[PDB]
Swiss-Prot record, chain B:
Disulfide bonds: none
GO molecular function: acetylglutamate kinase activity; ATP binding
Protein name, per record: Acetylglutamate kinase
Lineage of source species: Bacteria, Pseudomonadati, Pseudomonadota, Gammaproteobacteria, Pseudomonadales
Family: Belongs to the acetylglutamate kinase family. ArgB subfamily.
Chemical reaction(s) catalysed: N-acetyl-L-glutamate + ATP = N-acetyl-L-glutamyl 5-phosphate + ADP
Superkingdom of source: Bacteria
Pfam family, one: AA_kinase
Function: Catalyzes the ATP-dependent phosphorylation of N-acetyl-L-glutamate.
Site, Transition state stabilizer: residue positions: 32, 246
Pathways per UniProt: Amino-acid biosynthesis; L-arginine biosynthesis; N(2)-acetyl-L-ornithine from L-glutamate: step 2/4
Positions contributing to substrate binding: 67-68, 89, 186
NCBIfam families (UniProt xref): argB (TIGR00761)
Curated annotation (Swiss-Prot), chain E:
Organism: Pseudomonas aeruginosa (strain ATCC 15692 / DSM 22644 / CIP 104116 / JCM 14847 / LMG 12228 / 1C / PRS 101 / PAO1)
An example Gene Ontology molecular-function term: ATP binding
Amino acids binding substrate: 67-68, 89, 188
Name assigned to this protein: Acetylglutamate kinase
Location of the protein in the cell: Cytoplasm
Tree of life domain: Bacteria
Key word Transcription present: no
One GO biological process term: arginine biosynthetic process via ornithine
Length: 296, 292, 298, 287, 291, 294
């Protein structure tokens, strides 16, 4: 329900934002949200609105999300403990059930709903749906008494394929795919995957314009606190070895370097806790957060 | 492999099934899966082959499943106590959250993986996906008693359903529905299959149960039944309580556009297949379909 | 820029307005831009970009433009003999040839270039293209007293639209092109005609059964004789506003348009101040119409 | 009854044959029947039905047929007297007009009438409909074999349109050349070219005997060109089987995944090669 | 060879002719061709060309052919010959096998071959093809004792599905008049009847019936035309019509009442005769329509 | 308005025209309107009508035109001096506005009207319509070390919007293109019409590129007409002074078209009534056919 001094400014901005938007109208966008950036409803609902508005403005967004708080609340209630190694939670059987249930039946459907309340049209999907996300088990590793020591963290996996047929069908039908990071193997078994990595692999598969990674923090930092933009593979590795990039940030650049070298103009790590982080990323070109491009 | 004599078997069956397969090619068949029995183990595999094969034979199956074991479990573990009544779970905010997550994330997906593990391409949806099942607070009178968050479908997104079918996918729908404000609703899986079927004007609505079907005073299966016949059949009362809701549902389906509704014994291996691949209709089948 | 402060606004507002916007995703809105004030380079750019946005947001815009003082400039520079009758310029063959060359070869294409400059795909056409706008000489009579036998005065190549090639416009629209039409019609003999851009705009909206017909003007709505913008008028209210003097001059053909337009298939006709920045965006983001909104039942 | 115990079977076996029926679902299958595998109606009809099946199951058949019976009696009635060399009959004018006439307006349209009685929709065609099979005269040994020619090219567009409009092309082996002259061509070679030209999944050669055999009655499979050519100079391969293999080696050499020579006399024959990986007959793959 | 000046001429008369052509751009025209005198060679190629030309110009032609000089000759070489005389040909199971084999395996495939040689894409079709022309027995009454004329039918259906697919793909359907039963027997039918029933089904613009006479003449032997249905039912009473013209006219009437915009009974001896019909607004022969 | 006896003639004429017409049904011919020369009318109408004919008959004509004379009259009336340097027109900012206005608002639309007067459906466009013709500045020099010579807003085609054309053609509309290109920042360029026509046929991989000129075709030093030449022969011919003046750009634009996907390109005498209709409806060795290896 709008007034003449309202529109005066809606229009002034959409109009002054056309150039930025125009750089994606008709191109596809994969947004990764969640994890620790999900914490408050107002932000959850806020993100939904931004995703729709994009659709409203000609972009075709594709959401991939993590779970964060709820996966842990439930696990608590069930009296199951959780541990992560290098940005991957150790997923034994009982845990894999909770994660598969909470991510695809609660979190996933709840984002689908926020988007739909804001006018959009979402389809909540997971790796099992039409084998959206096929995945062999991920062989993890550690090490300086050396030769590779192979770890076993549980039912954790790695993307081997992605049904773009389904994804493309849904987008072209004007729907906003919202995807949980659970994949299926050759035997129909389940695999818990880091939402980042799924976001990456779906973007590559889809050859999108840009992959947004919304997170818990300004962007990727050096141990000194400063956000570092424009890295290339060699810099990242030096930094990981340095003890700089650790925990859940590991799978994060890993997505970005790959998603870019896999067909994606850009991959931008950003603080999603920031009100309208998404809309801001698109209607503007703020030199905020860690950006990784090859865009010629 | 399939030893020579093996494939010849496989052959004359299809070669005998051509008439039937031909009878329902390119049609919607809303199959309510869920028997307190058909969802145990061995019938799980049979239902998937049945559903896939239907598809491969160019038939359009739309599975609508119930919950049950899976929902009961998690509720116990969370030490949550819920009671029933009219065949419907009283449902407060806390358990509506558990019901929705288990149905939409554990049960729904599993049935989908299953179908897929047998060469199918299933898409698991729930009433929230593109507002696929619109609904409202259902009214429980009890000669008004509040049953909680239980409602009745007020509309179905045929748009999206038609698309999946056209893309040659098998929709597996969880019976949760959304209201005008985005509030969740736990709806009975029969009514849903029933309404989804009305909205698509499906050929058949197939409700799987744990009974031989409907029977009369003498235990006989009462099969070739029509809308008015069933109505009279209830006034007189050969149709007892528990079976009523299921039949009042199958009623509205024929009233609403479905032409042949089958009440089936899901305990029987490959029942859906037998109910199609063989024009018998062993069970209870309501309709206004001309014989000759 | 776009501050957090200023996006917090966009969000809460484009949202509540997403319904409004969305209500036009699907059809055509025929817009008549072109005028006197709005011929400024600043006003045209903004408009060009407004039109592109509308396109981005799923609206199919169809522009009909008029105006330009570069028509008179060229007549003078060419020393084309000027002749008037009853205070109107007689548009003879020499004048019509220049009017056509200017509206179709310069104004038309300049708008087309601005639209393309901001991301749209504009096609510049006149009534000659595939006979987009068929026309016939318009019969004019000198102003006289009521009781006196009217006199037909020949003011030249001035016409009236007898038909529109919707096939052409439907094709272009469907291919994601923004038609940009010059108000020049063709007659049975291939002769040209200069038609009031408002009337052309209105015939084009009717032919396409457009959702909206927007007539941008330079006065911010149809005012009542005391200075107030009026809205949601019906034929009776317009018939008496004219009868008593408040509607006059060029505001006359404009409502006659709207009215006809709406009586002929357009769902709503908006008469707005085209001088206001983002003017056209403003009539689609709120059912709140800044200015006159004619809708015969809505 | 589909009964109890015989349904649990029907299920586990229909299921397990599903992956196999799948390697062909989108792909095209050229089926050459005819020949002397055609001999009885009863049987012949079962073939038609066997075809409608592959079609209800979402497989795309393209039938190429020959003649034996019908081309024999009419050539007999009219006093002609047919002659043969290396699997190909020596066709002169009255012989060509008769072959073109029989194969095209009798044999061909009748199979089409069969496939239609069992549900599917078939269009009877010859190399002349839209110049479907283009041809020059065959270069062989000089042997005035007469009006026998080769396949210059196939109207694949006509075929792809029909197939995807849901029809079954039934193709008589008659070819046409630049000037519009008929040429009689072996139904085998036609099928092999119509398969190469469509890049079909597999070429099915239904014959009279089960698989190309050696002088000892021993069936062979997986034969490569070097050895097969030893088998022709030898005496081992002769008559009708001469064009049969060569059309098979070519189809593989040029596009078709595989090509299988089986016993068309066996009821449900075709189905068996699909619903299984039988291992019987003479299958030609590519290594 | 349009030399110099002629170029100047054709440009003028082609333009005139364009609007007449436009009428029929996009339209379907079912044409009945097969006959007696028409069976000249020189003249057959002219029809093939005319049809390709119609295709180039934007019109979609559908060809229905009859003609059996080619049958009598095979029957003969096989010493089976019989008598028929009453519009239709009394077909025993034997003559039928031959009728169906020469009609759809020789005659038909040749009209296809010609059109093809001239730049067309023709498809030879009989009623057996996808049950293109569904049929049944017949009931011929002696002028009521029934005269046995089975293996001869009444058209009871037309797969328009197929014809549409062929047209849309820019093919020229060429259909031999053989009907197929609900069981699969062939019945031998009359071209004009097939053509008209094929016209009705496609709701064509025109049914063109190539005869061997300038059109429907009257008492004084003057060409008739541009009249209506009720009008034509009239002159039948006048008893003006006779022979194999009677049904040719009943073919059209129905066709017209059956949706078809207009029917033309024209002399198919005249070269480019069919084109004369689409180029001149009027109709150069006898034109039945009633809109 | 119909004839009868000459309905029979149209029949006989198109009947025999089929072998040739058939060659191009469904193919697009990029025709550059020229030889217009004396601004006749029986000749401008003749062309318009030949183009509609080709369309009726199933051919897909695309037209490209110039307008030197017309630009010249206007510049003259506005008292703006005119200058040509090596065939291209020196185009300062003021000349560009006049060039663009006349070619796209007058000459262009007038051919459209003519084609429509004869039955066609023509669309008049310039490079600025949906960036139909993308261009950049052309670099010109001279050997009075060459020196760069600024001759104004004269560009060279950098790209064509086939999307728009294909759509137009498929809708049974005949595109009429004025040779004005657009730059990166929206500047307007004035391009040789032969060159634009060449780039368009290339982009469209056209069956034929027809250049109607005012002469007969490419000729010897003795006035004879050369036909079906190779890219190697055209070089020896320009190399000895056989080809010069405006004929140079013409042929160079013709080879390019062929070395870029156009089947055949011909230089034709556009002064001959129905010049178009004859290079199709018949087959004469009249003109200069350039096909490389065909
Ligand atoms: N170099 C680094 N720069 C920034 N954050 C880092 C870095 N190394 C590790 N991190 C960790 O990554 C976290 C965000 O990743 P994560 O916990 O996986 O959540 P999510 O993927 O759900 O957004 C930060 O809260 C921080 O503790
Ligand atoms: N009731 C009225 N309300 C508003 N404007 C009116 C009214 N009656 C007449 N006008 C005149 O209409 C003019 C605007 O339209 P028009 O005459 O077509 O000129 P322009 O080309 O500047 O738009 C106003 O400048 C005003 O003088
Ligand atoms: N080496 C061989 N192995 C098997 N069959 C052979 C061989 N050489 C010749 N044949 C003959 O080839 C026949 C099949 O080919 P052909 O006579 O042309 O009939 P069809 O056209 O029905 O295939 C068999 O019936 C058999 O008599
Ligand atoms: N009123 C009539 N007007 C014109 N021709 C007629 C009329 N009545 C009968 N006919 C005869 O009908 C003939 C055409 O029918 P028919 O002899 O059966 O041959 P076909 O079917 O081979 O064209 C004309 O050649 C003419 O002799
Ligand atoms: N070998 C040549 N063959 C043909 N024309 C030539 C030759 N050398 C030069 N010309 C000149 O090129 C002219 C054609 O090009 P041009 O003057 O640009 O005119 P247009 O392209 O407008 O018809 C001919 O009229 C002729 O005077
Ligand atoms: C394997 C794995 O670590 N998975 C993630 C998936 C959710 C996410 O990325 O937030 C996890 O927390 O369990
Ligand atoms: C309301 C209600 O009873 N819901 C059902 C839905 C699942 C079903 O039918 O199995 C329930 O168990 O909670
Ligand atoms: C040339 C030639 O041999 N033709 C084969 C065609 C039929 C077939 O292969 O069965 C023939 O017997 O006449
Ligand atoms: C029954 C009947 O009319 N038969 C015709 C069919 C051929 C035709 O009309 O040309 C016949 O000669 O046998
Ligand atoms: C640059 C240039 O040559 N311009 C030409 C364009 C006209 C044409 O090609 O006909 C000119 O006179 O201005
Ligand atoms: Cl840190
Ligand atoms: Cl005022
Ligand atoms: Cl010279
Ligand atoms: Mg993480
Ligand atoms: Mg005014
Ligand atoms: Mg053989
Ligand atoms: Mg020149």
């Amino acid at each position: 329900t709008l007034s003449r001094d309202d529109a005066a400014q809606v229009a002034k901005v959409l109009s002054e934002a056309l150039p930025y938007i125009r750089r994606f109208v008709g191109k596809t966008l994969v947004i990764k949200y969640g994890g620790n950036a999900m914490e408050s409803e107002e932000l959850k609902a806020g993100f939904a609105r931004d995703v729709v508005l994009m659709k409203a403005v000609g972009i075709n967004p594709v959401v991939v999300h993590g779970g964060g708080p709820q996966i842990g609340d439930l696990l608590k209630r069930l009296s199951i403990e959780s541990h992560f190694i290098d940005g991957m939670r150790v997923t034994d059987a009982a845990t894999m059930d909770v994660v598969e249930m909470v991510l695809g039946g609660q979190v996933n459907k709840d984002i689908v709903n926020l988007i739909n309340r804001h006018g959009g049209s979402a389809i909540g999907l997971t790796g099992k749906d039409a084998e959206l996300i096929r995945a062999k088990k991920l062989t993890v590793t550690r090490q300086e008494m050396t030769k590779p020591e192979i770890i076993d963290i549980g039912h954790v996996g790695e993307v081997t394929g992605v049904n773009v047929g389904l994804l493309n069908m849904l987008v072209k039908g004007d729907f906003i795919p919202v995807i949980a990071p659970i994949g299926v193997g050759s035997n129909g078994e389940s695999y818990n995957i880091n939402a980042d990595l799924v976001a990456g692999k779906v973007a590559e598969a889809l050859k999108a314009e840009k992959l947004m990674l919304l997170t818990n923090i300004a962007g990727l930092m050096d141990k000194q606190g400063q956000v570092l933009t424009g890295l290339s593979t060699e810099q990242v590795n030096e930094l990981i070895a340095d003890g700089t990039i650790y925990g859940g940030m590991l799978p994060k650049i890993r997505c970005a370097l790959e998603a870019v070298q896999g067909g994606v103009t850009s991959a931008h790590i950003i603080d999603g806790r920031v009100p309208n982080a998404v809309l801001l990323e698109i209607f503007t070109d703020s030199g905020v957060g860690t950006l990784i491009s090859n865009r010629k």
